[PDB]
Amino acid sequence: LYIQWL
């Protein structure tokens, strides 16, 4: 799993 929020 990889999550990014910017």
Residue numbers in the entry: 1 to 6
Q: What does the published report state?
A:
Here, we identify an evolutionarily conserved hexapeptide sequence as the major aggregation-prone region (APR) of gastrointestinal peptides of the glucagon family: xFxxWL. We propose that the pH-dependent changes of the protonation states of glutamate/aspartate residues of APRs initiate switching between the amyloid and the folded, monomeric forms of the hormones. Our results highlight the dual role of short aggregation core motifs in reversible amyloid formation and receptor binding.
Four polymorphic crystal forms were grown from solutions of APRTc5b. Although the chains in polymorph B are also arranged according to the class 8 topology, different interactions stabilize the interfaces.
